[PDB]
Design a protein around this ligand. Structure first.
Ligand code: HPN
Ligand code: HPN
Lengths: 146, 145
């Protein structure tokens, strides 16, 4: 289902959480498959932001929650695999694939993502995922800018 | 390039704190050369490069040929790295690159998160993640061919 890329690191520590903040980010990655905005919002600070970089940002925990609730109305996150995780200066970075299934069409796509997370006292204060939107949209037959 | 609300204003934010980070920031400075021959010197023979919306290039020659093609169609006019970090042999850069499409004269500020793998100071992998369509629409050139 998710295959291992040729460029995957051979350093085990590169694929494992190596700090307390990295551990929380991997727990959050595991939780994504719940498709549950109310569960996921508990990982967030009140003063926070979320952006899927092809689309506009959400600022503040309520906007974040409302975005996730909309997302999970249209798609399921069926699987997440994080190949690489690392961190510096209060930012955690994840190189991953998320398997996304469009609820209106039944079609799925393996989306390659590089994301960044800012944690303050173990809660998410920023989350930005970078990826290409058009290939995903074309694969699952749903225009994801509206 | 103006500063995002979310970008750190810390004096150290996008500054290198390791040898590998230092090499990556030198590489970022070198991108505005638009010079594939200059850039390829940063790479190991066993390497790869991918702009993630498009297919990867494997091996140093393929990487060089990709860069030479890239610089035939666009200029990287500026690069600003907001955040840099690293662990376990990988370096990450959150940046904006200002790209100008030579056929049309139009520019776009492209938001990118990239990852670099280094072995003995040379690049064994470079992957940049971003949205291609928004860029294509802004500069009037179909970037998948
Ligand atoms: C708006 C579509 C983007 C959803 C990607 C969600 C994810 N992180 O897998
Ligand atoms: C296919 C277009 C991608 C070019 C991005 C180059 C860069 N890193 O600024």
């Amino acid at each position: 289902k998710i295959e291992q890329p040729r460029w995957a690191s051979k350093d085990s520590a590169a694929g494992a959480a190596s700090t307390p903040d990295e551990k929380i980010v991997l727990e959050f990655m595991d939780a994504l498959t719940s498709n549950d905005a109310a569960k996921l919002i508990e990982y967030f600070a009140e003063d926070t932001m979320y952006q899927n970089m092809p689309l506009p940002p959400a600022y503040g925990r309520d906007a974040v929650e409302q975005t996730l609730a909309g997302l999970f109305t249209v798609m399921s996150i069926d699987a997440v695999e994080t190949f690489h995780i690392g961190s510096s200066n209060g930012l955690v970075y994840t190189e991953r694939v998320d398997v996304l299934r469009a609820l209106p069409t039944g079609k799925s796509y393996n989306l390659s993502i590089l994301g960044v997370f800012q944690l303050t006292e173990g809660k998410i204060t920023g989350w930005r995922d970078y990826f290409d939107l058009r290939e995903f949209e074309e694969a699952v037959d749903l225009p994801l800018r509206g």
